[PDB]
Structures are given as C-alpha cells and as structure tokens.
Paper text:
The Spike protein is a viral factor that mediates attachment to cells and fusion of the viral and cellular membrane, functions associated with the S1 and S2 subunits, respectively. One human MAb designated CA521FALA demonstrated potent [name]-[name]-2-specific neutralization activity in vitro and in vivo and had no risk of ADE.
In brief, the purified extracellular domain of S protein (S-ECD) was incubated with full-length CA521FALA IgG or CA521FALA Fab and then the mixture was applied to prepare cryo-EM grids. Two RBDs in the S-CA521FALA Fab complex were “up” while another one was ‘down’, and all three RBDs were bound with Fab. The focused refinement on one [name]–Fab sub-complex succeeded to improve the resolution of the [name]–Fab interface to nearly 3 Å. At this resolution, the details of the interface between CA521FALA and [name] were unveiled clearly. Hydrogen bonds and salt bridges around [name] residues A475, E484, G485, N487, Y489, Q493, and S494 contributed to the interaction between [name] and CA521FALA together with the hydrophobic interactions around Y449, Y453, L455, F456, F486, and F490. Superimposition of [name]-CA521FALA Fab and crystal structure of [name]-ACE2 showed that CA521FALA would clash with ACE2, so mAb CA521FALA may block the interaction of [name]-[name]-2 with human ACE2 by occupying the binding site directly.
Author numbering:
A (entry chain B): 10 to 84, 89 to 120
B (entry chain C): 2 to 25, 28 to 105
C (entry chain A): 333 to 526
C-alpha cells in the first residue's frame, strides 16, 4: 500500500508445517533498482536477530502466520519477500530457501 | 563485512562458460541465488558446493572455494539473470552486490 | 501347521517409513499369539477387536501386518478413529478395526549419532487418508492460489518430513517400532489358527 512516511509497517505471509529444528523464516528487502538487503531471520527454536534496523517481526506456526512489523517507515520503499530456510541437512529433505513477492511505497 | 563480486556484468554470447567470482576472510556456508528480472530470487547453491532441489537448465551448479576467492563456473543456456551471493555468520547475514549477464 | 513367520515382521532389520508402511499378508500358517502377548517388551499392546489373550485359538482367513516407525507421542494415534498427522495423512485405521496394535521402543536401533533422518511422514495432504489407503506419491502440495506446476517453492511444500530421532530425545520423541495386525474374515476357509 501507499503507507504514510511514519505509519507503522505490517506484512504477513502464510507458512505451514511446524518449526522442525533447522527451519529459518527470514525477510528480505529489495530497494527499487538496487541490490538485495536482508531484514531478520527467525530460526526454528526461538533465535531472532536483525540488522541495525529496529524491526519487530515474529513468526507463529500455530495460526500459520509470519508477521513483519516496524516502527518508522521514512521514505523505506522496497519489495519484501518471505523466505523459508532449512539450513541443516535433514536427510532426504535437502536444505532450501523459497521466496514470496510483495511491495511497499511511501509518501 | 562485504562480499565483493568482481565481474560487473560480464557477457559475451549464449552457450559459453561464465565464471563469477565472490572474493569476500569468512568461515563456511556461503550461498548462491539467481534472480531473473521481475521475479523472486531463488536458491541455487546452498553450502558453497552443493546444489538445491533444481537447476535443471544447465545443471552446472559449480562451487569451488572455502579458500575464499569463491567461484561459480557455469554454462549459459537461455538462463540470463542476476546472480547474488550470501554470507552466513549470523550477525550480518549479508548479501553481495550481484552482477548481470547482459 | 507351520508356525506363522513373526520373526520376519517384528524382528526385521529395516522397518518401513510410516508414509510407506510395509504390508505383509499372513495366511496358510498356524499363528502362535503366546510368544507375543507376554513378551513383556512391547510398551504398547492394544487389541481393538478380539481380546488379546483369547484370540490364540481363533481363526481368521488373513492377517495383514502393517509395519512402520513413529514417535512415542504418535503411537496414541494408531487406533480406530483418531486425529493428528499420522491418522490423517499417513495411516488411518478404520472405525471398524478388528485387530491388535503393537509398539516397542526402538531407541537402540533407529537413533544414530546426530539423528536418524531415514524415516519420513506425510506432513501435507489435500484430504485425509481413507482407511488403509497408502499414498506414497511425493507430489508437491499446494497451500495457496498459485499453481505449483511441479516446481517446489513458497506455497508449494514438499509433502514429506523427516523424523529427527536421536538417542537423547524425550520419551515422546524417541522411535517406537509399530506393527498393526489386522485380522480379516471372509467367505473362505480359515487358514490362520493357533
Ligand atoms: C526375535 O528373535 C529372538 C531371537 O533371535 C527371539 O527370542 C524373539 O522371540 C524374536 N521375536 C519374535 C517376535 O518372535
């Protein structure tokens, strides 16, 4: 949407199938016409870490929803993707990562 | 904490072996994604050597490194896009300034 | 009057995964259910049809043994009319079940140094499994409006998932080798007695 330059940010994605000991759920910016930048990953147990950006995102496997919030949205405009990491070899289940699509603009 | 990528949009012709460098100094776990224009980037090579569940277009998923002048040397059949690399050390889980193939 | 081969079902070295549970028909043999009930090793022995220590001298025309491996907390779902991801998408016992369910802990056989990821279960499925149905296909489940087209990605989940069995898990998260003996009766002479 065309969010106001200080209205809080809020995006959600649908994720199904638990938190089985190795699963990431990260969020990745993409400023328009520039390179990739990442914002936060939540591991399978509880470990949440970010960039020097003060994001406030949290996943929840019950209710099957990933949520990515923020506080200040000055001017940033980008395209936000929902990843799905598995950075641990689970036998047949190879580690992987897959992304959504979704945009945001300000004024 | 950069992942400097050298080639800066190398391109000669289709059907040729292109070598992209990742001259990052880091421990292991460096990943390689491919993003076509106007599309969501997708995983190609996760743990710097292996291959994800895919790349059936040249199947030349190449990773030869951990001495950290990392390289991907792959063919180019109808598979022109932008190519990115990603560190894994979990404070700056950063990306690289990827290059194109046109 | 040759003894039925329970040394090939219970004592087998490679138990099948739950989503591809092994199925063995047993017929034309005398069945000794006395080496089984009082073996004192099975953590779970629940007979949902004929009472356990009376079916020794009861004859059935076929005994179908379904062997697989599941977690400890998921052996309570091997019963007629249950829920979860094992009774729903992997192995559903019919509501008219007439047989026995046997389950013995296998923390000494199916738990390796860092995890025995060789056993999988069907985490995703469009519709619940009809009783005694077996869905071994690995088609990519779809969880959104976007067609999958056979390429796996977001909203296109790989249906299976791997048990992370370890020797140092909780009692629930330890493997339990499970054999479900389903007796059936038809309009044919009985071949399985005691
Ligand atoms: C498995 O084999 C052992 C000895 O080889 C035997 O004592 C045991 O009874 C067998 N299991 C069954 C279910 O008969």
């Amino acid at each position: 949407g065309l969010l106001k330059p200080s209205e809080t940010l809020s995006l959600t994605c649908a994720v199904y199938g638990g938190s089985f000991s190795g699963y990431y759920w990260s969020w990745i910016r993409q400023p328009p016409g520039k390179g990739l930048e990442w914002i936060g990953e939540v591991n399978h147990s509880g470990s949440t870490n970010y960039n020097p950006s003060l994001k406030s995102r949290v996943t929840i496997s019950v209710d099957t929803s990933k949520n990515q919030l923020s506080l200040k949205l000055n001017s940033d405009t980008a395209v936000y993707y929902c990843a799905r990491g598995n950075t641990m070899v689970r036998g047949v289940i190879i580690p992987f990562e897959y992304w959504d699509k979704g945009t945001l603009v300000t004024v | 904490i950069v992942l400097t990528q050298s080639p800066a949009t190398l391109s000669l012709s289709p059907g040729e072996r292109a070598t992209l460098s990742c001259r990052a100094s880091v421990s292991s776990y460096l990943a390689w994604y491919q993003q076509k224009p106007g599309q969501a980037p997708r995983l190609l090579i996760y743990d710097a050597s292996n291959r994800a569940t895919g790349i059936p277009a040249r199947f030349s998923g190449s990773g030869s490194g951990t001495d950290f002048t990392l390289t991907i040397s792959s063919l180019e059949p109808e598979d022109f896009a932008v190519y990115y690399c990603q560190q894994r050390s979990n404070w700056p889980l950063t990306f690289g300034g990827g290059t194109k193939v046109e | 009057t040759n003894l039925c081969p329970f040394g090939e079902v219970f004592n087998a070295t490679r138990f099948a995964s739950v989503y591809a549970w092994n199925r063995k028909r047993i017929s034309n043999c005398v069945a000794d259910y006395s080496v089984l009930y009082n073996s004192a090793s099975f953590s779970t022995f629940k007979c949902y049809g004929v009472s356990p220590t009376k079916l020794n001298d009861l004859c059935f025309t076929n005994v179908y043994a379904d062997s697989f491996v599941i977690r400890g907390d998921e052996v309570r779902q091997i019963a007629p009319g249950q829920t979860g991801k094992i009774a729903d998408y992997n192995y559903k016992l019919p509501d008219d079940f007439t047989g026995c369910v046997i389950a013995w802990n296998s923390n000494n056989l199916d738990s390796k140094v860092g995890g025995n990821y060789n056993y999988l279960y069907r985490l995703f499925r469009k519709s619940n499994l009809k009783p005694f149905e077996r869905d071994i296909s690995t088609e990519i489940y779809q969880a959104g409006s976007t067609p999958c087209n056979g390429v796996e990605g977001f909203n296109c989940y790989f249906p299976l998932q791997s048990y992370g069995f370890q020797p140092t898990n909780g009692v629930g998260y330890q493997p339990y080798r499970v054999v479900v003996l389903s007796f059936e009766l038809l309009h044919a002479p009985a071949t399985v007695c005691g």
